[PDB]
PDB file of C-alpha atoms in Angstrom:
ATOM      1  CA  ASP A  11       0.000   0.000   0.000  1.00 22.27           C
ATOM      2  CA  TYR A  12       1.490   3.303  -1.161  1.00 26.09           C
ATOM      3  CA  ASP A  13      -0.477   5.723   1.032  1.00 24.59           C
ATOM      4  CA  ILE A  14       1.192   8.812  -0.528  1.00 26.53           C
ATOM      5  CA  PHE A  22      -4.096  13.799  -2.229  1.00 21.34           C
ATOM      6  CA  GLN A  23      -3.564  16.944  -4.269  1.00 20.17           C
ATOM      7  CA  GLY A  24      -2.379  16.069  -7.779  1.00 21.31           C
ATOM      8  CA  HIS A  25      -5.941  16.578  -9.000  1.00 19.51           C
ATOM      9  CA  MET A  26      -8.168  18.503  -6.583  1.00 20.15           C
ATOM     10  CA  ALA A  27      -6.428  20.484  -3.841  1.00 19.58           C
ATOM     11  CA  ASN A  29     -13.679  21.298   3.737  1.00 18.05           C
ATOM     12  CA  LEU A  30     -14.975  18.095   2.160  1.00 19.80           C
ATOM     13  CA  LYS A  31     -18.455  16.577   2.285  1.00 18.20           C
ATOM     14  CA  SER A  32     -16.766  13.603   3.960  1.00 17.94           C
ATOM     15  CA  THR A  33     -16.280  13.493   7.704  1.00 19.88           C
ATOM     16  CA  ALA A  34     -13.790  11.955  10.106  1.00 21.47           C
ATOM     17  CA  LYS A  35     -14.533  11.425  13.808  1.00 23.53           C
ATOM     18  CA  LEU A  36     -11.898  10.642  16.446  1.00 21.45           C
ATOM     19  CA  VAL A  37     -13.309   7.681  18.417  1.00 22.58           C
ATOM     20  CA  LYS A  38     -10.396   7.049  20.831  1.00 18.88           C
ATOM     21  CA  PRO A  39      -7.340   9.109  21.752  1.00 17.04           C
ATOM     22  CA  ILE A  40      -4.195   8.280  19.710  1.00 15.90           C
ATOM     23  CA  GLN A  41      -1.438   6.302  21.455  1.00 14.12           C
ATOM     24  CA  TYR A  42       1.822   7.885  20.414  1.00 16.58           C
ATOM     25  CA  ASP A  43       3.596   5.527  22.793  1.00 19.32           C
ATOM     26  CA  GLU A  44       2.496   2.322  21.070  1.00 20.68           C
ATOM     27  CA  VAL A  45       5.406   1.515  18.752  1.00 15.30           C
ATOM     28  CA  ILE A  46       4.717   1.061  15.027  1.00 18.72           C
ATOM     29  CA  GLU A  47       5.906  -2.140  13.390  1.00 17.22           C
ATOM     30  CA  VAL A  48       7.493  -1.600   9.999  1.00 12.87           C
ATOM     31  CA  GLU A  49       7.178  -4.566   7.664  1.00 14.11           C
ATOM     32  CA  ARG A  50       9.784  -3.610   5.071  1.00 12.71           C
ATOM     33  CA  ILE A  51      12.959  -1.593   4.590  1.00 13.67           C
ATOM     34  CA  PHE A  52      12.668  -1.513   0.778  1.00 15.12           C
ATOM     35  CA  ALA A  53      10.273  -0.698  -2.038  1.00 17.42           C
ATOM     36  CA  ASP A  54       9.369  -2.496  -5.215  1.00 19.17           C
ATOM     37  CA  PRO A  55      11.007  -1.470  -8.552  1.00 23.28           C
ATOM     38  CA  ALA A  56       7.775  -0.203 -10.102  1.00 24.22           C
ATOM     39  CA  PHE A  57       7.608   2.379  -7.360  1.00 24.05           C
ATOM     40  CA  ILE A  58      11.236   3.551  -7.468  1.00 24.90           C
ATOM     41  CA  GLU A  59      10.949   3.931 -11.241  1.00 24.41           C
ATOM     42  CA  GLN A  60       7.687   5.828 -11.170  1.00 22.80           C
ATOM     43  CA  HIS A  61       9.400   8.359  -8.939  1.00 23.52           C
ATOM     44  CA  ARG A  62      12.635   8.356 -10.909  1.00 21.47           C
ATOM     45  CA  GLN A  63      10.761   9.398 -14.033  1.00 21.14           C
ATOM     46  CA  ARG A  64       9.131  12.113 -11.945  1.00 22.41           C
ATOM     47  CA  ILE A  65      12.519  13.534 -10.898  1.00 23.02           C
ATOM     48  CA  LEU A  66      13.807  13.452 -14.496  1.00 21.05           C
ATOM     49  CA  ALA A  67      10.714  15.197 -15.807  1.00 20.10           C
ATOM     50  CA  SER A  68      11.434  18.196 -13.589  1.00 18.90           C
ATOM     51  CA  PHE A  69      15.221  18.029 -13.580  1.00 19.91           C
ATOM     52  CA  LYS A  70      16.077  16.490 -16.949  1.00 19.16           C
ATOM     53  CA  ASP A  71      19.818  16.708 -16.216  1.00 21.90           C
ATOM     54  CA  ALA A  72      19.654  15.321 -12.673  1.00 21.85           C
ATOM     55  CA  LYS A  73      22.762  13.307 -11.841  1.00 21.22           C
ATOM     56  CA  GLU A  74      23.034   9.852 -10.218  1.00 20.44           C
ATOM     57  CA  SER A  75      24.364  10.838  -6.776  1.00 20.92           C
ATOM     58  CA  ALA A  76      21.284  13.030  -6.643  1.00 22.77           C
ATOM     59  CA  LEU A  77      18.716  10.395  -7.535  1.00 21.30           C
ATOM     60  CA  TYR A  78      19.963   7.906  -4.950  1.00 23.77           C
ATOM     61  CA  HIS A  79      19.648  10.586  -2.339  1.00 23.91           C
ATOM     62  CA  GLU A  80      16.151  11.702  -3.198  1.00 24.72           C
ATOM     63  CA  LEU A  81      15.026   8.166  -4.006  1.00 26.19           C
ATOM     64  CA  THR A  82      16.398   6.733  -0.776  1.00 26.39           C
ATOM     65  CA  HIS A  83      14.353   9.301   1.087  1.00 23.55           C
ATOM     66  CA  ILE A  84      11.222   8.479  -0.855  1.00 21.33           C
ATOM     67  CA  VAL A  85      11.516   4.873   0.373  1.00 19.58           C
ATOM     68  CA  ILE A  86      11.977   5.505   4.102  1.00 18.60           C
ATOM     69  CA  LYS A  87       9.215   8.124   4.261  1.00 21.17           C
ATOM     70  CA  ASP A  88       6.947   5.828   2.327  1.00 23.25           C
ATOM     71  CA  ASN A  89       7.588   2.767   4.431  1.00 22.75           C
ATOM     72  CA  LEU A  90       7.357   4.840   7.647  1.00 21.84           C
ATOM     73  CA  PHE A  91       4.438   7.052   6.615  1.00 21.60           C
ATOM     74  CA  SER A  92       2.359   4.133   5.459  1.00 24.00           C
ATOM     75  CA  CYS A  93       2.851   2.130   8.659  1.00 22.83           C
ATOM     76  CA  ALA A  94       2.119   5.108  10.929  1.00 22.76           C
ATOM     77  CA  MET A  95      -0.922   6.001   8.935  1.00 20.29           C
ATOM     78  CA  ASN A  96      -2.195   2.411   9.215  1.00 20.90           C
ATOM     79  CA  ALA A  97      -2.218   2.819  12.982  1.00 20.41           C
ATOM     80  CA  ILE A  98      -3.683   6.329  12.994  1.00 21.10           C
ATOM     81  CA  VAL A  99      -6.657   5.308  10.847  1.00 21.71           C
ATOM     82  CA  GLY A 100      -7.597   2.943  13.627  1.00 21.50           C
ATOM     83  CA  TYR A 101      -8.754   5.787  15.888  1.00 22.47           C
ATOM     84  CA  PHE A 102     -11.222   7.289  13.481  1.00 19.94           C
ATOM     85  CA  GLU A 103     -14.751   6.787  12.314  1.00 20.21           C
ATOM     86  CA  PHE A 104     -15.122   7.650   8.663  1.00 16.21           C
ATOM     87  CA  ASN A 105     -18.145   8.714   6.693  1.00 15.23           C
ATOM     88  CA  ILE A 106     -17.138   8.760   3.043  1.00 16.74           C
ATOM     89  CA  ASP A 107     -19.536  10.804   0.943  1.00 14.53           C
ATOM     90  CA  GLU A 108     -21.035   8.696  -1.875  1.00 13.93           C
ATOM     91  CA  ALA A 109     -20.428  11.239  -4.662  1.00 11.51           C
ATOM     92  CA  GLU A 110     -17.180  12.679  -3.312  1.00 11.18           C
ATOM     93  CA  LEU A 111     -15.699   9.208  -3.750  1.00 12.53           C
ATOM     94  CA  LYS A 112     -16.745   9.062  -7.421  1.00 13.06           C
ATOM     95  CA  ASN A 113     -15.144  12.452  -8.097  1.00 13.81           C
ATOM     96  CA  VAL A 114     -11.837  11.255  -6.686  1.00 11.34           C
ATOM     97  CA  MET A 115     -11.961   8.111  -8.773  1.00 14.97           C
ATOM     98  CA  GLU A 116     -11.987  10.543 -11.712  1.00 15.82           C
ATOM     99  CA  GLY A 117      -8.702  12.395 -11.313  1.00 18.47           C
ATOM    100  CA  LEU A 118      -7.237   8.925 -10.754  1.00 21.43           C
ATOM    101  CA  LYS A 119      -9.152   7.429 -13.690  1.00 20.23           C
ATOM    102  CA  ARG A 120      -7.593  10.043 -15.986  1.00 18.97           C
ATOM    103  CA  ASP A 121      -3.945   9.446 -14.981  1.00 20.78           C
ATOM    104  CA  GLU A 127      -8.705  -2.734 -12.001  1.00 19.61           C
ATOM    105  CA  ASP A 128     -11.633  -0.782 -10.597  1.00 17.46           C
ATOM    106  CA  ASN A 129     -12.305  -1.822  -7.003  1.00 17.93           C
ATOM    107  CA  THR A 130      -8.622  -0.994  -6.594  1.00 19.01           C
ATOM    108  CA  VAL A 131      -9.296   2.543  -7.764  1.00 17.79           C
ATOM    109  CA  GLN A 132     -12.111   2.877  -5.255  1.00 17.87           C
ATOM    110  CA  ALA A 133      -9.896   1.525  -2.492  1.00 19.47           C
ATOM    111  CA  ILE A 134      -7.324   4.141  -3.513  1.00 20.40           C
ATOM    112  CA  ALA A 135      -9.838   6.982  -3.727  1.00 20.02           C
ATOM    113  CA  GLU A 136     -11.001   5.855  -0.275  1.00 21.99           C
ATOM    114  CA  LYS A 137      -7.506   6.159   1.121  1.00 22.50           C
ATOM    115  CA  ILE A 138      -6.885   9.573  -0.384  1.00 26.15           C
ATOM    116  CA  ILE A 139      -9.966  10.914   1.396  1.00 23.19           C
ATOM    117  CA  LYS A 140      -9.235   9.297   4.772  1.00 20.01           C
ATOM    118  CA  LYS A 141      -5.709  10.696   4.682  1.00 20.72           C
ATOM    119  CA  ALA A 142      -7.148  14.120   3.870  1.00 20.37           C
ATOM    120  CA  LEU A 143      -9.569  14.052   6.803  1.00 18.54           C
ATOM    121  CA  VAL A 144      -6.888  12.879   9.174  1.00 21.83           C
ATOM    122  CA  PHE A 145      -4.423  15.534   8.102  1.00 20.64           C
ATOM    123  CA  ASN A 146      -7.100  18.179   8.464  1.00 19.51           C
ATOM    124  CA  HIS A 147      -7.422  16.930  12.029  1.00 19.38           C
ATOM    125  CA  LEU A 148      -3.829  16.851  13.262  1.00 18.38           C
ATOM    126  CA  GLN A 149      -3.006  20.172  11.599  1.00 20.82           C
ATOM    127  CA  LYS A 150      -5.107  21.502  14.455  1.00 20.40           C
ATOM    128  CA  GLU A 151      -3.543  19.429  17.240  1.00 21.07           C
ATOM    129  CA  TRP A 152       0.045  19.965  16.010  1.00 22.15           C
ATOM    130  CA  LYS A 153      -0.587  23.494  14.800  1.00 21.08           C
ATOM    131  CA  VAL A 154       0.977  23.403  11.352  1.00 22.80           C
ATOM    132  CA  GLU A 155       1.137  26.069   8.700  1.00 23.67           C
ATOM    133  CA  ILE A 156       2.942  26.999   5.511  1.00 24.04           C
ATOM    134  CA  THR A 157       3.398  30.779   5.327  1.00 25.87           C
ATOM    135  CA  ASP A 158       3.578  32.883   2.152  1.00 28.55           C
ATOM    136  CA  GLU A 159       7.261  33.307   2.881  1.00 29.76           C
ATOM    137  CA  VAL A 160       7.913  29.584   2.652  1.00 30.86           C
ATOM    138  CA  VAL A 161       5.887  29.237  -0.541  1.00 29.20           C
ATOM    139  CA  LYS A 162       7.685  32.105  -2.252  1.00 30.07           C
ATOM    140  CA  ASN A 163      11.142  30.805  -1.384  1.00 28.34           C
ATOM    141  CA  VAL A 164      10.171  27.328  -2.514  1.00 28.38           C
ATOM    142  CA  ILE A 165       9.147  28.549  -5.959  1.00 30.47           C
ATOM    143  CA  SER A 166      12.254  30.654  -6.260  1.00 33.56           C
ATOM    144  CA  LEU A 167      14.628  27.790  -5.492  1.00 37.59           C
ATOM    145  CA  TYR A 168      12.820  25.845  -8.205  1.00 36.19           C
ATOM    146  CA  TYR A 169      13.600  28.507 -10.797  1.00 35.48           C
ATOM    147  CA  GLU A 170      17.269  28.473  -9.797  1.00 34.70           C
ATOM    148  CA  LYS A 171      17.996  24.755 -10.163  1.00 34.34           C
ATOM    149  CA  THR A 172      15.610  24.523 -13.096  1.00 30.07           C
ATOM    150  CA  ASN A 173      14.982  27.427 -15.450  1.00 31.58           C
ATOM    151  CA  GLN A 174      11.375  27.262 -16.523  1.00 29.78           C
ATOM    152  CA  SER A 175       8.741  29.894 -15.988  1.00 30.93           C
ATOM    153  CA  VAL A 176       7.339  29.888 -12.476  1.00 27.84           C
ATOM    154  CA  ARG A 177       6.266  33.511 -12.665  1.00 26.85           C
ATOM    155  CA  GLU A 178       2.832  32.056 -13.330  1.00 25.74           C
ATOM    156  CA  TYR A 179       2.987  30.466  -9.866  1.00 25.25           C
ATOM    157  CA  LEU A 180       4.047  33.564  -7.965  1.00 22.92           C
ATOM    158  CA  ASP A 181       1.310  35.906  -9.108  1.00 25.48           C
ATOM    159  CA  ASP A 182      -1.908  33.883  -9.550  1.00 22.65           C
ATOM    160  CA  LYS A 183      -3.865  33.082  -6.387  1.00 21.88           C
ATOM    161  CA  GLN A 184      -4.992  29.725  -7.815  1.00 21.27           C
ATOM    162  CA  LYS A 185      -1.545  28.375  -8.647  1.00 23.50           C
ATOM    163  CA  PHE A 186       0.260  30.013  -5.754  1.00 22.29           C
ATOM    164  CA  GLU A 187      -2.210  28.611  -3.208  1.00 23.35           C
ATOM    165  CA  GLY A 188      -1.714  25.355  -5.050  1.00 25.24           C
ATOM    166  CA  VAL A 189       1.939  25.166  -4.041  1.00 27.74           C
ATOM    167  CA  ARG A 190       1.035  25.842  -0.413  1.00 25.25           C
ATOM    168  CA  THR A 191      -1.155  22.715  -0.416  1.00 23.89           C
ATOM    169  CA  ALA A 192       1.615  20.500  -1.753  1.00 20.91           C
ATOM    170  CA  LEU A 193       4.109  21.855   0.789  1.00 19.75           C
ATOM    171  CA  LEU A 194       1.579  21.380   3.571  1.00 22.12           C
ATOM    172  CA  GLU A 195       1.209  17.753   2.585  1.00 25.61           C
ATOM    173  CA  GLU A 196       4.898  16.953   2.638  1.00 24.04           C
ATOM    174  CA  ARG A 197       5.060  18.585   6.058  1.00 22.79           C
ATOM    175  CA  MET A 198       2.196  16.659   7.653  1.00 24.41           C
ATOM    176  CA  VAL A 199       3.912  13.495   6.449  1.00 21.94           C
ATOM    177  CA  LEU A 200       7.192  14.463   7.997  1.00 18.98           C
ATOM    178  CA  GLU A 201       5.211  15.510  11.096  1.00 15.28           C
ATOM    179  CA  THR A 202       3.233  12.288  11.397  1.00 17.57           C
ATOM    180  CA  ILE A 203       6.508  10.359  11.266  1.00 18.72           C
ATOM    181  CA  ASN A 204       8.069  12.648  13.895  1.00 14.99           C
ATOM    182  CA  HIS A 205       5.412  11.643  16.425  1.00 14.80           C
ATOM    183  CA  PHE A 206       6.047   7.907  16.721  1.00 19.81           C
ATOM    184  CA  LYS A 207       8.642   5.316  17.766  1.00 23.22           C
ATOM    185  CA  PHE A 208       9.245   2.688  15.076  1.00 24.48           C
ATOM    186  CA  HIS A 209      10.329  -0.924  15.289  1.00 21.10           C
ATOM    187  CA  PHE A 210      11.680  -2.681  12.204  1.00 21.57           C
ATOM    188  CA  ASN A 211      10.387  -6.241  11.781  1.00 19.43           C
ATOM    189  CA  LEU A 212      13.434  -7.777  10.126  1.00 18.97           C
ATOM    190  CA  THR A 213      13.548 -10.901  12.311  1.00 16.75           C
ATOM    191  CA  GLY A 214      10.356 -10.842  14.387  1.00 15.61           C
ATOM    192  CA  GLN A 215       7.971  -8.468  16.226  1.00 15.34           C
TER     193      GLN A 215
END
């Protein structure tokens, strides 16, 4: 399960209720230290599509990170979803299956279902942990992208829609890092 909700659509008709308090002391068991090829490749093509001339040393670095975060984020999320009651809006689910249907079927609905749950949970902890991406951060982020790259990002600086779009993405990578920062992990290499 690759649990890592913005690519398409950035309050939702779906609701998430916290049934029990979360146990940040219960250690999370991590099942694997690696990822499958299909996944490393899908991301490698993503890094080459934005940094055509990206070197090797670079890829390993970024890719290595993608694996740990993914293995850790997924396992922490699988515990966190256990403290919530979810009411997934009938139509909202079909709209998510769309942005995913454009990029066999029950799999897509399982996926759409996980995108939504994640959303609701992140909405929740943002409160608890008090997390925010300021305009400063966003602006610097776009700038650094124009330096290492060279394409037009001007469109992102001055256009409320696009600019606020980058804030969302940044906010997602931060909740992930934040979720991971709040748990002790145990790696199941031999036993549990």
